[PDB]
Design a binder for this molecule. Structure first.
Ligand SMILES: O=C(O)c1ccc(Br)cc1
Ligand SMILES: O=C(O)c1ccc(Br)cc1
Ligand SMILES: O=C(O)c1ccc(Br)cc1
Ligand SMILES: O=C(O)c1ccc(Br)cc1
Ligand SMILES: O=C(O)c1ccc(Br)cc1
Ligand SMILES: O=C(O)c1ccc(Br)cc1
Ligand SMILES: O=C(O)c1ccc(Br)cc1
Ligand SMILES: [Fe+3]
Ligand SMILES: [Fe+3]
Ligand SMILES: [Fe+3]
Ligand SMILES: [Fe+3]
Lengths: 102, 491, 82, 305, 491, 305, 82, 102
């Protein structure tokens, strides 16, 4: 159908953060670390779907600054309930991304 | 000083070796491993994209549980059980019964890979996976256990998978097919990729959104914490898929995904569909079942499947049509045969709800509404004999769920049947028949609950006989209308 | 004597197991199926109920018996209005 | 139907004399695959995995009519396991940090790096075999309480593997010319000292009967590793001024003793059926020779220089 | 193996020694230590009944905080700020403003003991006490901080103790008197025994009960967690009391308790009193202020005081009468002068509330009711000028709270005045005057806010001038009726 | 008055260029007692404690216009201090457990127990003096950020005391005839090797000016303890086959370096006012001789038999 | 000139600061206190308002001034009805 | 007053346990470990006041059994919000008690 093809043909990537102390810091980090991407946020109360087109980076350093307490990248797992895109993760950041463009 | 994981990670998965005292095929038998003849050396390129290490795992998982349990403890007196809409309580009962012991079975899916996958990274990530599923099974027994003293239906959080109740058979026939009953690579593709990036987001995050609207934070917080583990261990699937594709097995990979997605879809439509569009109070419906499907399965999962180099399933258009229709009929079946369930189905057809249903599924009142009109009139006229069944629904030989179609003004119903080795089988869709045909040895001698009834395995051959066969141990345990028909007053 | 069929009644939402008799006419079979459908999930209506093999174009004659019909146990039938 | 009141706990625990514990609530009677002898899994009764379980679980000569009553003597659940291991592992990680600050690896006796490269770093292969094997006993055991002990044992095997990977890499920083982190696979495959162990594990990993798997792994192989590998390595480390290894091995031995404790409790449970004595004794005598040769070849290699 | 604490505990508190290079009195000066001439050796018999040790403390407190913070995190979306009754929101504003920086000041009371107590066990338990109050100050800043962005009144969680606002002066005058302004032994008896086993149970647990009724579990869980620390460090008081009694200082100990309890009472009556009987919504009032007083202060505290060997205070009957009457007038004062508060007082006088007040305090309507009748009629007539003050209340020179009495049908009001060193002071009770006379050097040159107003320290001498002096920075920060007078619609 | 929008954070932090951290929010500008120079506390301006603060805090020669701006370089708060120290303390307790299992104390060189009884166990007195002294700097310091560092330092001093109590008792189990746990007060009061330290601490505990208290405690006494007590003990433990004491002391030295870190940060903050250089240097010169004598007497005792 | 008193008005709930003049009669003083009480928290009534030292048995004459009365600034007075 | 007199003249001792996982195990333990005392319970939702006359003992062993997980006596501090009576605590039990009888 038209609605379904439109839904499939997206390039949205990014984290789905469960309700808790990481929601606002992750939204802020997405905005800061992807300047000139528009970040979209869908609030479903128990989780928030955060996305950008094609690629979205969260760096450890920015997330620590927005969270306001010491933060290692691996701890994001406590609150990363899902994500859109493939994930490329390391000690400095996580990148959500797609190989293809739809 | 400490040395960063990137510098020693490779040694943690440098564990493949060339066997000399038994053969490679003796060590990794195809029936358990599923390597499709791809040589050991090829599997060494498997690269799990979501890594962890033992010291980090124990520390982080300690933290995750401390939060889940603290939240539960702090909210014991929030009056969820006492004050929640009974439709919400039924959602909890259905969830814990359908999920807890199935999570524990998933330990075995993960174990199958930990022993039999030829990819070393897969064997390690599957060890964390075994642990994660243990966590999930234990959390989902511990949490409902406090409600045992409130309601015998909560006993089914433990009992369901030990029963022959029809929905438990549907759950086990699915999970035993994709989790416990196939080789390691099949598990990687059908469980971790297909089911666990494709459907579990619906039941553990979509449902969490509804739980938060309903003000049940103990539950929302629990299941969203569980799904954080899934987001990690599910990432075992993609790299297996990529490896099969690189080694000429794209066709077989595609077939496994196409099968697993359809099988998951049918069970999901009977369990989550009615929860999202009927049991959850209208005011707490964050989105409709279809809207959540388009978010999680179409927008997220299917787009990811394409990014990885697979194709849309061949049954795409049938699937889209099914999302509009199937769960409305599955709901109607579960409610009309509510006495066979271990939860109390809510009818969900007050006028205000029917307005919402019409908005979300235009044409609903001229279809399912026609059946609900007859049901509603009987309740209003105290003709309750007519709102309880006196026969069995016909059941799919694949999904184990009743054979349904679209009722009312443009009635259409189709059963897809097959004669095979001296038996007549009936399936609820073209795809369900196709699944059977892909692997008849997996399925052919299985007998669904109606087959057993007809063969004499259910005695006495009566409603009560079937209910006792299904494991009910007291009158209280059998499903009733969630609101004791109080909803008809609004009609 | 007892003969199981799976029956789909017109305007209903499902197929049900209905046990009929080998010597029931199609009229009798239709009434046995209707018992589990009409005034339960399907509104009553004027008209003559007929029986056919599932999704078939051709209808069984009204007085034909299950035995004469060639139907096999557990085959699917529809009950529809003419 | 009868009318019955709500129960204080699961119906299967409702007759317990004592209040059910966290362990009881979350651990007991979870394998529904043992309920139907003819169809362990809800599929065709002769599906491949149904045939596998009928042969390698249900038909084991090791027999008991209530395996589900088995109890882990430590009564561990996921939550308590992680509390315990985060404690032990935090401690080990802190030792690594501090011994590294103190440049421990520089002060070991001349040539110790070569003994480590030959006798220690390839332990990652051995430990991974224990991890794979433990996962096999998990998936085949006829009670969830047994399977749970095996899950935690699988995780512990990976813990040991990871210690070994970490220390192999770390040692290679001080001693970059000893083949540390480079030649372990070749040693595991070709070096005589490893070949008894490798033959033992390749064969043990192909013992598919659940009972034989359990006995060979936990009653034969693992105790041999304690007495013939772990302890002799501590003794050699002491002779060579490696003070970190003995402390690390002591932490690993806590896990090993725990594995032995649950195994012994399972033996005691099994022995309720007198027929099982001969079954277990038979498997022990079958596997003992391979274990003894594995230990001999390893020790002969270790005591070289 | 590890050795149990009982076997090495004595060594942790074997730390007294006989000074040789300075005198005992130089090391423990009476003005900071408060030993009353009791020799070093006698203090060694001090035996804290609620012990802990450093490794246990850090482990257990880590756990307590993990739970408090997880609960806060899991409930951020519960919409407490948005959906709570405004009276409940004002209760939070009052609490955090009155409490957070005062908890931090309590660190100094504990530090006073850690350095200057002659009892070794006291010095160690006070070190844990310093840490506990640090925790309490930090929690009760971190928690309200999220509401800064919603409402400027929450700035006062930080700002209040930095202001000269009248209620902050009352809080500071009390806590500086019993916490930071006296010797170590006075702290042990006035703070840890009197205030902390006597009254904090009310504000932290009685209020937690109302909070749980109101469905604010983040707050209820926080403050009850805080009180678990108090239950331990408050036990420094009893053994000090017992030691003074054994060493011939019973009369001194009795006087310190009598004084501290009364001083606590007057402040508690202006802060917690109106919260429990007026700001908390009627349906959330677990018990009345008086009922809680009888549970916690009479039934628990006064009974424990008698068990330890002290007597009921000389002012017993006066205290009982005050419990029936004082907070009703204090509430009326806070409300009528609401523009000077940093929270929005709820009037709490709808008919249904007035009925509850009458049941809980027979005669209420013929007393305070009479004033509320005049107020209500002016609101209904839109004469809002008549429900805002154009002068200042007269204020007690001890408690810093307005001088009040019983209004209406059996009007009775008494000021207890005192000439001292050429100055005229006014006190709101016989006991407050007595507290002054016990230690004039502590109080004599202090000027209350009305003294300052009359001395020309507040310019201009108007409402605006007083509001500027009290530290308000915007219109929003000034207190208003919690419901914007919507309660008048029910009258 | 005007109508203003809500602020993102506390009014005093609202002009920060970046988002306030957990540390900033819960730690900064909490001493209201510095607001009114005539009345630190809300009582009679010449109440005894007001006179105490006006003399020993407000009138200190160590001066700065904004002590509140001081920042703990580690930015510790209660929550993060407990996370850190539960890690470090669980490690030390694990060392105690394992070294006890291995019977470490039995293997120290002959006579070491007497050196411990004399030069180690009475450290509980010195550490308690540091604890009392740290609590005094806490209660007198003119900024809450300074006082917070002092609170955590008070707790660390008690941690060290507790280590010493635990080990004194433990040692005495193996060596019951050495006066361990029995004679420490006598040693602290009468043994020449302790008299320099005791004179130093009795005098330091009577330096009531906050600045002098801070300088003498953190810039003179505590660094002396590191170089003249902690490190020499580690060296002597090494010569006597005590392998536990050096690890214990390394954990305590982590705390001691943390105390020096915040202290140096406070010094740097103070030196923004040029006048403070002469003030600090003068207190250092005043207190150094006592500290040197303390160290010398302690080392002579540690070196003998 | 300004003369502060603390005044308690009959049937009110508190004592308030009220600044009067040194040469005000008691009648003028009573009216200045009444401003802050009557029709705010106290019902108006008929009768003559009288001034007395706090809780005293004797009333000041109506025409007596503050100056003539012997009151000291900041002393407490009641305003009550005959 | 008689109401105040009556309230003061009690000999009730015992733990006040805050809302959470210790409330029911502590009530059950009080009953088991003080046979032949009536245990009274006052539920205030955020806390529960549990009491007996004169003396109430909670043993570690019984509390561990009723709580259902390994438990050291010191941990009770996590949930012991207040208590009536004097406290005598040790590794095996906590005893709440009064010296006097009123
Ligand atoms: O460094 C990594 O590989 C990494 C970092 C964060 C997460 Br979540 C997962 C993996
Ligand atoms: O893999 C999973 O996570 C899973 C599997 C089955 C069920 Br029921 C729930 C979860
Ligand atoms: O509290 C108890 O003693 C108890 C509780 C449940 C069961 Br089953 C058995 C005993
Ligand atoms: O654990 C063992 O070593 C063992 C166990 C059972 C039998 Br029978 C013989 C030996
Ligand atoms: O000691 C205490 O716990 C305390 C002191 C003051 C304030 Br405000 C709150 C608590
Ligand atoms: O810490 C020191 O050693 C020091 C500090 C400040 C000054 Br000025 C001189 C010396
Ligand atoms: O052993 C002790 O001294 C002890 C035990 C529990 C608690 Br709570 C407090 C103290
Ligand atoms: Fe799971
Ligand atoms: Fe999973
Ligand atoms: Fe506190
Ligand atoms: Fe306190």
């Amino acid at each position: 159908s038209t609605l379904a093809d439109q839904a499939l043909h997206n390039n949205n990537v990014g984290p789905i953060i469960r309700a808790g102390d990481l929601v606002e810091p992750v939204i802020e980090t997405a905005e800061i670390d992807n300047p000139g991407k528009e970040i979209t946020v869908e609030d479903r109360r128990a989780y928030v779907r955060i996305a950008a087109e094609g690629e979205l980076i969260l760096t450890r350093k920015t997330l620590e600054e927005q969270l306001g307490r010491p933060f290692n990248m691996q701890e994001l797992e406590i609150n990363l309930a899902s994500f859109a895109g493939q994930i490329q993760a390391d000690e400095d950041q996580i990148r959500f991304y797609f190989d293809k463009t739809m | 000083a400490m040395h960063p994981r990137k510098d020693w990670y490779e040694l943690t998965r440098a564990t493949n070796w060339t066997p000399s005292y038994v053969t490679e095929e003796q060590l990794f038998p195809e029936r358990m491993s599923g390597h499709m003849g791809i040589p050991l050396e090829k599997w060494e390129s498997y690269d799990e994209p979501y890594k962890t290490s033992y010291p980090e795992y124990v520390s982080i998982q300690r933290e995750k549980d401390a939060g889940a349990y603290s939240v539960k403890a702090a909210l014991e007196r929030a009056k969820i059980y006492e004050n929640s809409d009974p439709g919400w309580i039924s959602t909890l009962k259905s969830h814990y019964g359908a999920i807890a012991v199935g999570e524990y079975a998933a330990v075995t899916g993960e174990g199958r890979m930990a022993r039999f996958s030829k990819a070393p990274g897969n064997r390690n990530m599957a060890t964390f996976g075994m642990m994660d599923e243990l966590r999930h099974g234990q959390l989902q027994l511990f949490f409902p256990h406090e409600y045992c003293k409130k309601d015998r239906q909560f006993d089914w959080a433990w009992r369901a998978y030990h029963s022959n109740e029809w929905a438990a058979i549907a759950a086990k026939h699915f999970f035993d097919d994709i989790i416990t009953g196939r080789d390691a690579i099949s598990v990687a593709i059908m469980l971790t990729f297909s089911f666990e990036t494709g459907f579990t987001n619906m039941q553990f995050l979509g449902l969490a959104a509804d739980a938060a609207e309903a003000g049940d934070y103990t539950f929302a917080n629990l299941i969203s914490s569980i799904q954080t583990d899934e987001s990690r261990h599910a990432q075992q699937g993609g790299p297996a898929l990529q490896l099969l594709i690189e080694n000429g097995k794209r066709e077989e990979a595609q077939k496994k995904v196409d099968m697993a997605i359809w099988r998951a879809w049918r069970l999901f439509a009977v369990l989550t569909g009615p929860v999202m569009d009927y049991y959850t109070p209208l005011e707490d419906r964050s989105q409709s079942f279809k809207e959540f499907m388009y978010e999680w399965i179409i927008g997220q999962f299917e787009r990811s499947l394409i990014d990885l180099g697979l194709d849309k399933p061949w049954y795409w258009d049938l699937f889209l049509k099914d999302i509009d229709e199937l769960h409305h009929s599955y709901h109607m079946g579960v409610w009309y045969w509510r006495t066979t369930a271990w939860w109390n189905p809510a009818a969900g057809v007050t006028p205000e709800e029917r307005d919402w249903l019409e908005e979300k599924y235009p044409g609903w009142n001229k279809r399912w509404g026609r059946c609900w009109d007859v049901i509603t009139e009987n309740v209003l006229n105290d003709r309750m004999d007519l709102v309880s069944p006196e026969t069995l629904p016909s059941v799919c030989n694949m999904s184990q769920i009743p054979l349904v179609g679209v009722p009312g003004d443009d009635w259409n119903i189709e059963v897809f049947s097959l004669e095979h080795n001296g038996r007549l089988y009936h399936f609820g869709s073209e795809v369900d028949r196709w699944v059977f045909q892909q692997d008849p040895v997996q399925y052919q001698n299985h007998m669904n609950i109606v087959d057993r009834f007809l063969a004499g395995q259910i005695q006495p051959m009566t409603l009560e006989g079937a209910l006792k066969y299904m494991g009910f141990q007291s009158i209280e345990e059998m499903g009733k209308d969630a609101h004791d028909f109080a909803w008809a007053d609004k009609c | 004597s007892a003969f199981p069929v799976h029956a789909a009644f017109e305007k209903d939402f499902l197929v049900q197991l209905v046990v009929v008799d080998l010597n029931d006419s199609m009229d009798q079979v239709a009434e046995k199926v209707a018992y589990h459908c009409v005034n339960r999930r399907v509104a009553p209506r004027e008209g003559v109920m007929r029986v056919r093999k599932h999704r078939s174009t051709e209808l069984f004659p009204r007085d034909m018996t299950i035995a004469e019909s060639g139907l096999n146990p557990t085959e699917v039938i529809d009950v529809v209005f003419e | 139907f009868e009318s019955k009141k709500p129960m204080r706990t699961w119906s299967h625990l409702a007759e317990m004399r004592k209040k059910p514990s966290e362990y009881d609530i979350v651990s007991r009677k979870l394998h529904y695959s043992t309920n139907n002898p003819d169809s362990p899994w809800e599929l065709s009764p002769d599906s491949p995995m149904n045939l596998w379980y009928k042969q390698y679980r249900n038909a084991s000569p090791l027999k008991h009519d209530n395996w589900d009553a088995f109890t882990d003597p430590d009564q561990l659940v996921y939550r308590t396991y992680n509390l315990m291991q985060d404690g032990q592992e935090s401690y080990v990680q802190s030792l690594f940090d501090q011994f590294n600050e103190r440049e421990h690896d520089q002060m070991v006796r001349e040539g110790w790096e070569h003994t480590m490269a030959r006798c220690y770093s390839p332990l990652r292969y051995l430990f991974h075999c224990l991890q794979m094997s433990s996962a096999y006993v998990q998936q085949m055991a006829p009670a969830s309480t047994i399977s749970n002990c095996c899950i935690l044992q699988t995780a512990d095997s990976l813990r040991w593997l990871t210690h070994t990977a970490y220390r192999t890499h770390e040692l290679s920083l001080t001693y970059p010319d000893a083949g540390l982190g480079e030649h372990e696979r070749e040693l595991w495959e070709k070096e005589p000292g490893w070949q008894g162990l490798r033959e033992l594990m390749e064969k043990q990993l192909t013992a598919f009967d659940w009972g034989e798997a359990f006995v060979s792994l936990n009653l034969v192989v693992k105790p041999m590793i304690v007495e013939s590998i772990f302890k002799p390595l501590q003794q050699q480390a002491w002779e060579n001024n490696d003070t970190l290894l003995p402390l690390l091995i002591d932490s690993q031995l806590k896990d090993a003793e725990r594995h032995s404790r649950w195994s012994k409790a399972l033996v005691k449970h099994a022995l309720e059926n007198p027929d099982n004595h001969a079954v277990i004794e038979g498997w022990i005598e079958k596997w003992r020779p391979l274990a003894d040769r594995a230990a001999e070849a390893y020790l002969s290699m270790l005591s070289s220089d």
